[PDB]
A paper describes a structure:
The m1G37 modification also prevents the ribosome from shifting out of the three-nucleotide mRNA codon frame (‘frameshifting’) to ensure the correct polypeptide is expressed. The absence of m1G37 in tRNAPro causes high levels of +1 frameshifting on so-called ‘slippery’ or polynucleotide mRNA sequences where four nucleotides encode for a single proline codon. To address this question, here we solved six 70S structures of tRNAPro-CGG in the presence or absence of the m1G37 modification and bound to either cognate or slippery codons in the P site. We further show that ribosomes bound to mRNA-tRNA pairs that result in +1 frameshifts promoted by tRNAPro-CGG result in large conformational changes of the 30S head domain, consequently biasing the tRNA-mRNA pair toward the E site.
In an attempt to reconcile the exact role of the m1G37 modification in tRNAPro-CGG in the context of a +1 slippery CCC-U codon, we next solved a ribosome structure of this complex in the P site to a resolution of 3.2 Å. Unexpectedly, tRNAPro-CGG moves from the P site towards the E site, adopting a position on the ribosome which we refer to as e*/E (where e* signifies an intermediate position between the 30S subunit P and the E sites and E signifies a 50S E-site position). The e*/E position of tRNAPro-CGG when bound to this slippery codon is different from the classical P/P position that the same tRNA adopts when it interacts with a cognate CCG codon (compare Figure 2A with Figure 2C). Therefore, the ability of tRNAPro-CGG to move towards the E site when bound to a slippery proline codon suggests that it is this near-cognate codon–anticodon interaction alone that is sufficient to destabilize tRNAPro-CGG. The e*/E position of the tRNAPro-CGG-mRNA pair is additionally coupled to large conformational changes of the 30S head domain. The same swivel and tilting of the head domain of e*/E tRNAPro-CGG occurs but our structure lacks EF-G. This result indicates that even with the m1G37 modification, interactions of tRNAPro-CGG with the P site are destabilized when bound to a near-cognate codon, promoting its movement toward the E site along with 30S head domain swivel and tilting. In our structure containing an e*/E tRNAPro-CGG bound to a near-cognate, slippery codon, the first three nucleotides of the codon fully occupy the E site, despite the codon–anticodon adopting an intermediate position on the 30S between the P and the E sites. In our structure of tRNAPro-CGG interacting with a near-cognate, +1 slippery codon, G926 instead interacts with U+4 of the CCC-U codon rather than the third nucleotide, thereby defining U+4 as the end of the E-site codon. In our structure containing e*/E tRNAPro-CGG bound to a CCC-U codon, the G966-C1400 interaction is ablated.
Numbering used by the authors:
A (entry chain R7): 1 to 47
B (entry chain RD): 2 to 273
The structure:
Amino acid sequence: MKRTWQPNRRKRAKTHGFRARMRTPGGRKVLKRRRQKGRWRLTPAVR
Amino acid sequence: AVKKFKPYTPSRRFMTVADFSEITKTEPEKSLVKPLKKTGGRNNQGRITVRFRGGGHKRLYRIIDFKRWDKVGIPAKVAAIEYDPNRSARIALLHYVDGEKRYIIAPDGLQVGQQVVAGPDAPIQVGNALPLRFIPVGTVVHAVELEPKKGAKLARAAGTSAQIQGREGDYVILRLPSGELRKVHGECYATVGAVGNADHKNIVLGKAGRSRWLGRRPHVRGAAMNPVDHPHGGGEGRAPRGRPPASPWGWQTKGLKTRKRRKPSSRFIIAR
RNA sequence: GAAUGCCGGCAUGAGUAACGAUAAAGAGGGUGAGAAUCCCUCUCGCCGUAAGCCCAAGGGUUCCUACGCAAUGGUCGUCAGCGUAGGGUUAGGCGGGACCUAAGGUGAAGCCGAAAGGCGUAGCCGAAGGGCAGCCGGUUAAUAUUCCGGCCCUUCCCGCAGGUGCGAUGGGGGGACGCUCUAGGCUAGGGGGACCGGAGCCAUGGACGAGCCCGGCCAGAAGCGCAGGGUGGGAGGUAGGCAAAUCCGCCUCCCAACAAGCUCUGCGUGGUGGGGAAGCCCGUACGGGUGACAACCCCCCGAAGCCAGGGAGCCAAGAAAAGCCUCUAAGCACAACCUGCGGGAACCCGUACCGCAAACCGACACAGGUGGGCGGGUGCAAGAGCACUCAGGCGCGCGGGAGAACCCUCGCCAAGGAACUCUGCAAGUUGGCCCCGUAACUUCGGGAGAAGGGGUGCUCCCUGGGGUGAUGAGCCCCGGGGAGCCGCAGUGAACAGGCUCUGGCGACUGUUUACCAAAAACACAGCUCUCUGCGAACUCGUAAGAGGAGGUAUAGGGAGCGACGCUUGCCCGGUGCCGGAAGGUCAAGGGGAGGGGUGCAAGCCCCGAACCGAAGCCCCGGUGAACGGCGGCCGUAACUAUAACGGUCCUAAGGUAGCGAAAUUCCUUGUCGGGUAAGUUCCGACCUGCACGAAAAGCGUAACGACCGGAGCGCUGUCUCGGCGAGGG
RNA sequence: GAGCUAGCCCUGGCCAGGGUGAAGCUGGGGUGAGACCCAGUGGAGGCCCGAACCGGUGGGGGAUGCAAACCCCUCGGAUGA
RNA sequence: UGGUUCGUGGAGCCAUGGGGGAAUCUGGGCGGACCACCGCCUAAGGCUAAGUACUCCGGGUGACCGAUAGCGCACCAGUAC
RNA sequence: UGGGAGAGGGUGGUGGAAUUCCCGGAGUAGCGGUGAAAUGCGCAGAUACCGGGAGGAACGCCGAUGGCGAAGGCAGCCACCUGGUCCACCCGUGACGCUGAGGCGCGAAAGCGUGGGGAGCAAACCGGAUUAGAUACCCGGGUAGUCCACGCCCUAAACG
Ligand SMILES: [Mg+2]
Ligand SMILES: [Mg+2]
Ligand SMILES: [Mg+2]
Ligand SMILES: [Mg+2]
Ligand SMILES: [Mg+2]
Ligand SMILES: [Mg+2]
Ligand SMILES: [Mg+2]
Ligand SMILES: [Mg+2]
Ligand SMILES: [Mg+2]
Ligand SMILES: [Mg+2]
Ligand SMILES: [Mg+2]
Ligand SMILES: [Mg+2]
Ligand SMILES: [Mg+2]
Ligand SMILES: [Mg+2]
Ligand SMILES: [Mg+2]
Ligand SMILES: [Mg+2]
Ligand SMILES: [Mg+2]
Ligand SMILES: [Mg+2]
Ligand SMILES: [Mg+2]
Ligand SMILES: [Mg+2]
Ligand SMILES: [Mg+2]
Ligand SMILES: [Mg+2]
Ligand SMILES: [Mg+2]
Ligand SMILES: [Mg+2]
Ligand SMILES: [Mg+2]
Ligand SMILES: [Mg+2]
Ligand SMILES: [Mg+2]
Ligand SMILES: [Mg+2]
Ligand SMILES: [Mg+2]
Ligand SMILES: [Mg+2]
Ligand SMILES: [Mg+2]
Ligand SMILES: [Mg+2]
Ligand SMILES: [Mg+2]
Ligand SMILES: [Mg+2]
Ligand SMILES: [Mg+2]
Ligand SMILES: [Mg+2]
Ligand SMILES: [Mg+2]
Ligand SMILES: [Mg+2]
Ligand SMILES: [Mg+2]
Ligand SMILES: [Mg+2]
Ligand SMILES: [Mg+2]
Ligand SMILES: [Mg+2]
Ligand SMILES: [Mg+2]
Ligand SMILES: [Mg+2]
Ligand SMILES: [Mg+2]
Ligand SMILES: [Mg+2]
Ligand SMILES: [Mg+2]
Ligand SMILES: [Mg+2]
Ligand SMILES: [Mg+2]
Ligand SMILES: [Mg+2]
Ligand SMILES: [Mg+2]
Ligand SMILES: [Mg+2]
Ligand SMILES: [Mg+2]
Ligand SMILES: [Mg+2]
Ligand SMILES: [Mg+2]
Ligand SMILES: [Mg+2]
Ligand SMILES: [Mg+2]
Ligand SMILES: [Mg+2]
Ligand SMILES: [Mg+2]
Ligand SMILES: [Mg+2]
Ligand SMILES: [Mg+2]
Ligand SMILES: [Mg+2]
Ligand SMILES: [Mg+2]
Ligand SMILES: [Mg+2]
Ligand SMILES: [Mg+2]
Ligand SMILES: [Mg+2]
Ligand SMILES: [Mg+2]
Ligand SMILES: [Mg+2]
Ligand SMILES: [Mg+2]
Ligand SMILES: [Mg+2]
Ligand SMILES: [Mg+2]
Ligand SMILES: [Mg+2]
Ligand SMILES: [Mg+2]
Ligand SMILES: [Mg+2]
Ligand SMILES: [Mg+2]
Ligand SMILES: [Mg+2]
Ligand SMILES: [Mg+2]
Ligand SMILES: [Mg+2]
Ligand SMILES: [Mg+2]
Ligand SMILES: [Mg+2]
Ligand SMILES: [Mg+2]
Ligand SMILES: [Mg+2]
Ligand SMILES: [Mg+2]
Ligand SMILES: [Mg+2]
Ligand SMILES: [Mg+2]
Ligand SMILES: [Mg+2]
Ligand SMILES: [Mg+2]
Ligand SMILES: [Mg+2]
Ligand SMILES: [Mg+2]
Ligand SMILES: [Mg+2]
Ligand SMILES: [Mg+2]
Ligand SMILES: [Mg+2]
Ligand SMILES: [Mg+2]
Ligand SMILES: [Mg+2]
Ligand SMILES: [Mg+2]
Ligand SMILES: [Mg+2]
Ligand SMILES: [Mg+2]
Ligand SMILES: [Mg+2]
Ligand SMILES: [Mg+2]
Ligand SMILES: [Mg+2]
Ligand SMILES: [Mg+2]
Ligand SMILES: [Mg+2]
Ligand SMILES: [Mg+2]
Ligand SMILES: [Mg+2]
Ligand SMILES: [Mg+2]
Ligand SMILES: [Mg+2]
Ligand SMILES: [Mg+2]
Ligand SMILES: [Mg+2]
Ligand SMILES: [Mg+2]
Ligand SMILES: [Mg+2]
Ligand SMILES: [Mg+2]
Ligand SMILES: [Mg+2]
Ligand SMILES: [Mg+2]
Ligand SMILES: [Mg+2]
Ligand SMILES: [Mg+2]
Ligand SMILES: [Mg+2]
Ligand SMILES: [Mg+2]
Ligand SMILES: [Mg+2]
Ligand SMILES: [Mg+2]
Ligand SMILES: [Mg+2]
Ligand SMILES: [Mg+2]
Ligand SMILES: [Mg+2]
Ligand SMILES: [Mg+2]
Ligand SMILES: [Mg+2]
Ligand SMILES: [Mg+2]
Ligand SMILES: [Mg+2]
Ligand SMILES: [Mg+2]
Ligand SMILES: [Mg+2]
Ligand SMILES: [Mg+2]
Ligand SMILES: [Mg+2]
Ligand SMILES: [Mg+2]
Ligand SMILES: [Mg+2]
Ligand SMILES: [Mg+2]
Ligand SMILES: [Mg+2]
Ligand SMILES: [Mg+2]
Ligand SMILES: [Mg+2]
Ligand SMILES: [Mg+2]
Ligand SMILES: [Mg+2]
Ligand SMILES: [Mg+2]
Ligand SMILES: [Mg+2]
Ligand SMILES: [Mg+2]
Ligand SMILES: [Mg+2]
Ligand SMILES: [Mg+2]
Ligand SMILES: [Mg+2]
Ligand SMILES: [Mg+2]
Ligand SMILES: [Mg+2]
Ligand SMILES: [Mg+2]
Ligand SMILES: [Mg+2]
Ligand SMILES: [Mg+2]
Ligand SMILES: [Mg+2]
Ligand SMILES: [Mg+2]
Ligand SMILES: [Mg+2]
Ligand SMILES: [Mg+2]
Ligand SMILES: [Mg+2]
Ligand SMILES: [Mg+2]
Ligand SMILES: [Mg+2]
Ligand SMILES: [Mg+2]
Ligand SMILES: [Mg+2]
Ligand SMILES: [Mg+2]
Ligand SMILES: [Mg+2]
Ligand SMILES: [Mg+2]
Ligand SMILES: [Mg+2]
Ligand SMILES: [Mg+2]
Ligand SMILES: [Mg+2]
Ligand SMILES: [Mg+2]
Ligand SMILES: [Mg+2]
Ligand SMILES: [Mg+2]
Ligand SMILES: [Mg+2]
């Protein structure tokens, strides 16, 4: 049966991308939590 | 008149399609007019406002001239009576002698070859738009503005007709198809004659298909719902609504007058 | 020492279930220390509209080669999609970007929002939509429309050559479009050949023969040829395409009325270029050589593909922008632009491998899921079905024996056929084509495949039509008629409805509880009520704003019923709604009679009664396809019985038509009849309706239903009543 | 967080092969002209059968499964909501 | 209406959103409704270190821990998953 | 050939009296109804008076015991189209005539389908009065219907 994860680099990068997080003020604060705790990947590595 | 169907299959015994014989042999439309894409939509900023609207055949909007005073005193000859899917009323082409091409609402009796003139002149017979300060009392008229220089806003649907009953100074009273006697300005333009194709009521959709093809999605009865969404909804088998018939937002839907009573346009209204 | 406590370790179950589709294995020869599992050969089996090839996503070294087997592989392992190391992805023409725009997003101008932020015509972003220039072979272990070979093309930049008023984000043409059904000519693909070329082979009884088997193509500029698409041409006037305009549009006269001509495609032909089987010999895991001066010819079927913007019909009425052409304005007419010929320049990213799967998503080498294209041959009427089989790829990563019970899956059965049982649940019968042949009823279409029957193979003869070859042979389609043969059986295997009567409910096609409910539930056309005069009513939002709708009473919203036929009676006392500038009550405000507190005083500050004060509520009317409701008792007619009738109490009024033990009836298996031998179910009636009833509609209604209930015929392991046999455990 | 799922917008694609034979049109009959009735063409439909496809009706298996929704036989739709 | 202990309480004072709406020292505010006396300041413009709070970093100390503790990590950790 | 009469029929246009509703002016204690009253309307200002607007159905006098048509039926007026009928001439055709089973056409009112229109009248229906009772005759209201376009009904005291 069709499961929940049907990958797409386009949807992943337009949704959880850095340029999508820097626009919204909620997403800008998302990067503050990841930098101050020290995440190695602030945004999901999309290729 | 319309043509019925033999019941070769079900939903055809009742389905009746209109008469397409008055349409001239001009099935494809004319470009340089209608280059607008109809913005097919159902919501404003995503959230649905008008419920049960969707589907529907793809259409193209034909830009219609409602400002007939742009070419006052300039005659125009019709050469095509076309079908407009954005309207119940048919349309007609206007090949002006000036050279401009424009779509106009096609009233009844407007045949090919007849020419149409606009302005305070242009005698009384179909198509000729005149301001209400010059149209004779007791005549059939349509495409009426309510306020000057704003465009035709009254009696644009099929078969509708407006009749002049009197005069009040610079204002002229009108008998609208709903029966309202509204006092509109005399300088408001109006096109004589009845809109025609009065047989739009006489058609029968036959099945649910034509509703979906027109774009009307299924209308869910409010009693089949549940109390969180609709007031009528809930209870056991076939709730007899148990309260005054209301709408999903709580307001009553049977006999509650909703116009504003403090409206400044109420002093130009007489009847129902 | 305990909290179904937290973390870690090891037991029990236990050498038990399982080892992941029943598509299937066996032998011989190699390597190796170790082979059922790796390599090679032979035999066997499976898929073959895939279980085979080619793309787009996603995955991101998995590809190739050398060396390995500690871990991964449901066993082994010398193997690998695993470990170590090296190599491999080459583009002006393929795809994407220095091209365009749609939904949507962003957003200068402008509007809004306590802040964050939100809307927003123009502009921009935004794509398997438009536009654009490459086809065929060869090489590597791994790449190729990318490298090589042949042939053909596209942009710019600079020069001479010939022409012209050139000339833009601006104007106009064009780009430009639906669904169904189809004509003409071609191509892909395929069938045949007594024609051509082939190593070879006569086997086991016969056959040296028009014998068997294999193969008889691909691309290809310019001209040609065939088919097809787009297009009229002048001459005036002109107030319109938001400046100008010879372009476009509109009016008039002329010749075309054609596709003649001018263009643009497709296909065939074409200088030249390439491929080239089966069999045998080799040694690769795989390629090579030869067969090879290889032939490369003729018929037939022939598309859903090409000419493409073809044609006809229909209504539900079928994107935008740029590339291209034309027009002109500032400018410039030593410029610039068009055609043609040279020389030069042509960037950035991907190309490997998987890709109905062991590499994507499902924790797994998971029987699940995944978009497009090719998808051969024969037979069954056909077809992408079904059975077998080319090319290709596999035997699904535990096996060997045995032949218990028991379970799954499958086959057969005496005699009876529903007695089993909630129910023929399951299973079984029928089953495809052709020809007879059909009922009540009905909305005249249907019901209809009704039901129910007959023919179906092969051989011989006579014979009719088409289509392609010329008005003939061959080839390919359908027939018609007459003789005869075999078997139990002729859609001989596979795929390919059991039927009839009636009732409930819903008109019908559909839709839904992903993962227990596909239904009488939802929806549907259709009917009614009600709101709504356009800055509409209503919805979302604090607002701007947007939907409605670039709609305008034949339109839009809400509510109810839910096709169609006949109908929807009474109550407006209560509630809702509608209409009522009277009256009562009614808060802030006006108003100050009068009174108070302070001071020596003017003054200052409080209360503060009549009187005028809106909406609402009360009051008066109307409204039930609005919320809702729609009685009881007693007595009377000449066999009894009953009550057409009369009287009385109360409510605002006191169920009409139609139906009725019902999806509604408790008593109740009401009672009569029909069915059965036997009928708490079923059907037709009576009415005593606990507790039907007219739009939460009433009564019927042809057709339809994987809905529900009852009966019957054919049929069977469903049962008396079980027995046996196969495969997987 | 709408890569599952529900609806809608923009743009593309897919539905083999058989039947049924509406309207229209041509010819004939017919009338004063029609209406209308026969053939022939025609190819309509939320039409019939049935694969891909989309579902998930009935039964059996499965139940620490191949599977946290599966498999076999059967079944509904398959030019349209 | 908010703030202050202040919740309408006799509700002042300090800010205000709405309506009306003056004066320049014999002018105004306050001293908890209001009035008189007596006293305190002189509003509707603004600037200002010091002393005060905190620990990403460095140092010192510890009747603080010692790999199931101590920060989530003494170890290439906000990693693998 | 030449004239005539006629409410013959179909379409379009158009006029006035009156009813009803609305707006305005002015006016007060009732109006209405019947054999009699009552329901009802009326201090929230009605009936009656005047002015203006709206809308529909019928056409007063002429108008008749009249006319026209096969029948049902047909009345303000104008215009268009087309029936039928009468008179004078003796011209033409030369019996071409009469009736008519079946068929076809028309066919009042009421009724049915779709849509419009709806002033008045008015089945069903509410209320008052009458009567012993009154599902009625009388009175206050009131829907379908009366009208129009098309389609269907196709009956009758369709009666000379
Ligand atoms: Mg354009
Ligand atoms: Mg938007
Ligand atoms: Mg948004
Ligand atoms: Mg519900
Ligand atoms: Mg609620
Ligand atoms: Mg109930
Ligand atoms: Mg309820
Ligand atoms: Mg109730
Ligand atoms: Mg109103
Ligand atoms: Mg203890
Ligand atoms: Mg312990
Ligand atoms: Mg433990
Ligand atoms: Mg053990
Ligand atoms: Mg055990
Ligand atoms: Mg055991
Ligand atoms: Mg075992
Ligand atoms: Mg296995
Ligand atoms: Mg297995
Ligand atoms: Mg071996
Ligand atoms: Mg070794
Ligand atoms: Mg096979
Ligand atoms: Mg095959
Ligand atoms: Mg990729
Ligand atoms: Mg992976
Ligand atoms: Mg690797
Ligand atoms: Mg490999
Ligand atoms: Mg190993
Ligand atoms: Mg192992
Ligand atoms: Mg495994
Ligand atoms: Mg490896
Ligand atoms: Mg560039
Ligand atoms: Mg770009
Ligand atoms: Mg763009
Ligand atoms: Mg846009
Ligand atoms: Mg924005
Ligand atoms: Mg925005
Ligand atoms: Mg925009
Ligand atoms: Mg493209
Ligand atoms: Mg390209
Ligand atoms: Mg080429
Ligand atoms: Mg490869
Ligand atoms: Mg020159
Ligand atoms: Mg130029
Ligand atoms: Mg240019
Ligand atoms: Mg343009
Ligand atoms: Mg052909
Ligand atoms: Mg070829
Ligand atoms: Mg061929
Ligand atoms: Mg051959
Ligand atoms: Mg040879
Ligand atoms: Mg022999
Ligand atoms: Mg051949
Ligand atoms: Mg010109
Ligand atoms: Mg101009
Ligand atoms: Mg000129
Ligand atoms: Mg060619
Ligand atoms: Mg050739
Ligand atoms: Mg060769
Ligand atoms: Mg190989
Ligand atoms: Mg196709
Ligand atoms: Mg095409
Ligand atoms: Mg076309
Ligand atoms: Mg652009
Ligand atoms: Mg100049
Ligand atoms: Mg560059
Ligand atoms: Mg490549
Ligand atoms: Mg490749
Ligand atoms: Mg598969
Ligand atoms: Mg799983
Ligand atoms: Mg495996
Ligand atoms: Mg798998
Ligand atoms: Mg997997
Ligand atoms: Mg698939
Ligand atoms: Mg595929
Ligand atoms: Mg094929
Ligand atoms: Mg085949
Ligand atoms: Mg065949
Ligand atoms: Mg098969
Ligand atoms: Mg059998
Ligand atoms: Mg037996
Ligand atoms: Mg037997
Ligand atoms: Mg039997
Ligand atoms: Mg029994
Ligand atoms: Mg038993
Ligand atoms: Mg029994
Ligand atoms: Mg049963
Ligand atoms: Mg069964
Ligand atoms: Mg059989
Ligand atoms: Mg019968
Ligand atoms: Mg029939
Ligand atoms: Mg039947
Ligand atoms: Mg049969
Ligand atoms: Mg025979
Ligand atoms: Mg034989
Ligand atoms: Mg022949
Ligand atoms: Mg036989
Ligand atoms: Mg089967
Ligand atoms: Mg069948
Ligand atoms: Mg039934
Ligand atoms: Mg019944
Ligand atoms: Mg149903
Ligand atoms: Mg159907
Ligand atoms: Mg069906
Ligand atoms: Mg579903
Ligand atoms: Mg479910
Ligand atoms: Mg869920
Ligand atoms: Mg659930
Ligand atoms: Mg179903
Ligand atoms: Mg608006
Ligand atoms: Mg709001
Ligand atoms: Mg409505
Ligand atoms: Mg219902
Ligand atoms: Mg019903
Ligand atoms: Mg009722
Ligand atoms: Mg009431
Ligand atoms: Mg009342
Ligand atoms: Mg009340
Ligand atoms: Mg007061
Ligand atoms: Mg005093
Ligand atoms: Mg009041
Ligand atoms: Mg007696
Ligand atoms: Mg009685
Ligand atoms: Mg009754
Ligand atoms: Mg009963
Ligand atoms: Mg009985
Ligand atoms: Mg039983
Ligand atoms: Mg019964
Ligand atoms: Mg009874
Ligand atoms: Mg009752
Ligand atoms: Mg009921
Ligand atoms: Mg009801
Ligand atoms: Mg019934
Ligand atoms: Mg029925
Ligand atoms: Mg169904
Ligand atoms: Mg069903
Ligand atoms: Mg058995
Ligand atoms: Mg056994
Ligand atoms: Mg066995
Ligand atoms: Mg989605
Ligand atoms: Mg396909
Ligand atoms: Mg026919
Ligand atoms: Mg169908
Ligand atoms: Mg199932
Ligand atoms: Mg189910
Ligand atoms: Mg099961
Ligand atoms: Mg069967
Ligand atoms: Mg079926
Ligand atoms: Mg089907
Ligand atoms: Mg406070
Ligand atoms: Mg306070
Ligand atoms: Mg203030
Ligand atoms: Mg004070
Ligand atoms: Mg004090
Ligand atoms: Mg100051
Ligand atoms: Mg400061
Ligand atoms: Mg400071
Ligand atoms: Mg400080
Ligand atoms: Mg630790
Ligand atoms: Mg330790
Ligand atoms: Mg008056
Ligand atoms: Mg006459
Ligand atoms: Mg009548
Ligand atoms: Mg009627
Ligand atoms: Mg009816
Ligand atoms: Mg009366
Ligand atoms: Mg009356
Ligand atoms: Mg009649
Ligand atoms: Mg009779």
